[PDB]
Design a protein around this nucleic acid. Structure first.
Lengths: 610, 103
DNA sequence: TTCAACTGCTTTCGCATCCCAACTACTTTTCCTCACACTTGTACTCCA
DNA sequence: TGGAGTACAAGTGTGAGGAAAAGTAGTTGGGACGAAAGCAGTTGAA
């Protein structure tokens, strides 16, 4: 019994240095904050398979599609047997076909036979009630919820010689009132959209609602998410919407509103922890582990943690970890929109000493978002814990253990036509390039055969001569057309700039060509102060620009050289804009436009102010 | 300056869903980029950029240059596309750099 | 021939209901960016 | 070996959306140095 309570509420929130101290002067850390002390706790997935099989909104009424818990059947009472583990999941086309043992990790068994009982309605929830330790035994009956009816299955004498579970069923009650029910729990006790009733389970499958019922119907809650749970064996129930928790005990006529969650948060999920005292609630904006009180079994609102994520689709599952000194309660919240879990570690001792340790987060598989996560009970400081997930938009279920110590078919469905006459007609082009490339690896190889020849020194003396007079031909039009009052190509010669075999020479040759035009109507843009845009560093030269690609394309090409040469021989001819006039030509085209606009755009056009 | 005259002026949200390409074409419809400027994409640089993105064997550089030659009007000189007739977008997606993204 | 209220006077200079404001809300001012329904041919065969 | 029906895309009007920093909407805070004397005409009733 620590001290800092409200009576009504009780907080240990997110790293805000919790609100109590006893001042126990015992030289033994003389403080008992709700915050505990230990080392870290990092978690590591053990990824393994178990089994297999408009969008701007989401349906709250659909709950799960699977379940996994140890079941002890009817014939295990008289005989020695105690506890068999099952997993029952929906399958089929629209989610309509509901269908085991543990070696060291939970895997599907030897005879691995799906017991496909057939329905004609969409599966929307699959859950057991659980068990009791005051009853001493385990329940051997499970109930499911569909759109058209409500069903109860009864698991009778699970077999060990054949690994086959024969299943029995009750009467699927259809709807007398046309309103879609939401949640089942037993501890046909069901919650319809706005009202509930108690259903009676029979003993005879060889061939309903009791005389007491209640309702919580709110005219101003709009959602279709409800929930029901039995609380603390008194035959008290707890009923939920997204706005309040009502406590109802149908033993008497006694109804109390406990949670009222309209103002700043909402009720999101509610797991009843197998501890018959402690039960964990997920609100929006806070995580609540409100237990039961020994005086009146009504609600011991215990140490709750302010969770940070704000969302509309959060769930929770919890696993108890039973140590001989104390009881842990790790709580796993998960969302349907992204791929993350969020955990927190609670501890419990004998004097209702609920505490808190810290939080951590890990990730999931990149394809989909999680939609159903369940912990295997594991039959019951180096904390170990294990569980199964299920991701939305994939029908696979994997198994995970946590210890203390991107392909889309839409891009596939865009290619690959089934047109066999058009198959090689497309495929000719991939064989057409088998010809055109091998010429290019061989023709510049003939330029690899020659090395700085005077015969190609002549070929580059001939190069600039048809660059000089071609410039002298491309200059002499622009002077006479200069009075335009309202740049060029450098691909005019289609005889050369194909078979020139030196990078440092032509870099000098264009610098030899740059120096020639001291006159007007001809300026340039320098390559070496601009060629760095591909390497994203300081590249002050054209000759060292090759030297970067020289070490770069060594491994990934057969003989690796003239391909690297030809692209460097391409880019300077790819920026073939060396045909700027002098400064006069755009400056005289500046002055013409401001004359044409009115005197209102004179003051609007002023660069170079400060 | 008025608030809606400055909320346009201060850039809040980035250009998205081809907002940048439309504003290129809307500008080129206002003042004509032809017969005074060269609507010429240096596609050799863009493919060399896209070769240098994912470290491929550079034979696909030489392939893609050949591939555009198979399907292109006036083989070089890639078309910067003005629009003034419609306020609709060009569903052919006639942006030349956006065309190379498919090639 | 007396009782009981109306009566002006103590010094000598100089000191000494109306308005305002707070914070948080909600709203208007507009300008900018595209889609959604309509229609003729053309294409792929349709029945003559 | 010409016609009857018909989906794929080139191509054309209607308003509906998006955003922000300015202003304005209701509560609460707050603004206002003096308890002097014998004496006299009028005036009490005898």
């Amino acid at each position: 019994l620590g001290v800092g309570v409200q009576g009504a509420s009780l907080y240990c929130p997110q790293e805000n240095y919790t609100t109590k101290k006893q001042e126990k002067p015992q030289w033994l850390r003389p403080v008992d904050d709700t915050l505990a002390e230990d080392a870290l706790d990092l978690h590591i997935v053990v990824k393994s398979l178990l089994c297999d099989t408009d969008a701007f909104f989401w349906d709250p009424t659909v709950a799960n599609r699977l379940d996994s818990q140890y079941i002890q059947t009817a014939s295990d009472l008289r005989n020695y047997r105690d506890g068999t583990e099952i997993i029952a999941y929906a399958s089929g086309k629209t989610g309509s076909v509901l269908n085991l043992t543990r070696q060291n990790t939970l895997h599907l068994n030897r005879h691995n036979n799906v017991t496909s009982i057939e329905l004609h309605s969409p599966i929307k929830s699959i859950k057991i009630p659980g068990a009791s330790e005051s009853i001493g035994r385990r329940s051997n009956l499970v109930g499911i919820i569909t759109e058209n009816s409500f069903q109860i299955f009864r698991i009778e004498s699970v077999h060990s010689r054949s690994c086959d579970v024969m299943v029995s069923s009750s009467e699927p009650l259809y709807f007398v009132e046309i309103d879609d029910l939401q949640v089942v729990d037993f501890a046909a006790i069901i919650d319809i959209k706005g009202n509930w009733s108690i259903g009676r389970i029979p003993k005879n499958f060889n061939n309903l609602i009791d005389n007491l019922h209640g309702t919580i119907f709110d005219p101003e809650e709009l959602s279709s998410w409800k929930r029901i749970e039995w609380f603390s064996h008194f035959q008290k129930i707890l009923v939920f919407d997204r706005s309040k928790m009502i406590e109802i005990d149908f033993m008497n006529n006694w109804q109390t509103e406990v949670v009222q969650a309209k103002a700043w948060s909402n009720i999101r999920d509610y797991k009843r922890i197998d501890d018959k005292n402690g039960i964990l609630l997920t609100s929006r904006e806070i995580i609540i582990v409100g237990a039961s009180e020994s005086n009146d079994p009504v609600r011991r609102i215990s140490w709750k943690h302010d969770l940070d994520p704000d969302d509309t689709t959060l769930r929770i599952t919890v696993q108890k970890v039973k140590k001989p000194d104390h009881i842990l309660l790790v709580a796993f919240v998960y969302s349907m929109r992204h791929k993350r879990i969020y955990m927190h570690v609670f501890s419990h001792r004998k004097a209702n000493l609920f505490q808190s340790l810290g939080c951590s987060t890990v990730l999931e598989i990149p394809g989909g978002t999680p939609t159903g996560i369940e912990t295997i009970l594991t039959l019951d400081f180096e904390l170990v814990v294990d569980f199964l997930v299920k991701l939305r938009n994939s029908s696979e279920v994997y198994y995970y253990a946590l210890s203390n110590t991107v392909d889309h078919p839409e891009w596939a469905s865009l290619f690959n036509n089934a047109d066999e006459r058009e198959k090689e007609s497309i495929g000719a082009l991939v064989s057409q390039i088998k010809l055109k490339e091998r010429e290019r690896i061989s023709r510049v190889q003939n330029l690899i055969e020659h090395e700085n020849s005077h015969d190609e020194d002549k070929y580059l003396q001939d190069l600039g001569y048809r660059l000089s007079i071609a410039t002298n031909e491309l200059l002499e039009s622009w002077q006479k057309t200069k009075d335009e009052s309202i740049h060029s190509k450098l691909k005019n010669l289609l005889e050369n700039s194909d078979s020139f075999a030196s990078i440092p020479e032509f870099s000098s040759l264009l610098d030899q060509f740059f120096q020639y035009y001291q006159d007007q109507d001809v300026t340039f843009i320098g390559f070496e102060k601009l060629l760095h845009l591909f390497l994203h560093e300081d590249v002050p030269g054209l000759d060292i620009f090759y030297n970067k690609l020289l070490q770069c394309w060594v491994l990934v090409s057969p003989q690796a050289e003239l391909l690297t040469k030809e692209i460097v021989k391409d880019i300077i001819w790819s920026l073939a804009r060396l045909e700027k006039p002098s400064l006069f030509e755009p400056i005289q085209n500046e002055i013409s436009r401001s004359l044409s606009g009115p005197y209102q755009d004179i003051i609007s056009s002023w660069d170079m102010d400060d | 300056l008025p608030n809606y005259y400055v909320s346009i002026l201060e850039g809040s949200i980035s250009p998205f869903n081809g907002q940048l390409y439309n504003k290129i074409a809307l500008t080129c419809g206002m003042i004509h980029f032809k017969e005074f400027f060269n609507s010429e994409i240096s596609c050799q640089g863009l493919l060399l950029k896209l070769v240098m993105q994912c470290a491929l064997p550079p034979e696909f550089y030489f392939y893609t240059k050949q591939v555009i030659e198979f399907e292109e009007t006036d083989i070089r000189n890639l078309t910067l596309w003005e629009r003034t007739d419609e306020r609709h977008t060009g569903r052919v997606s006639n942006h030349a750099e956006l065309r190379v993204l498919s090639y």
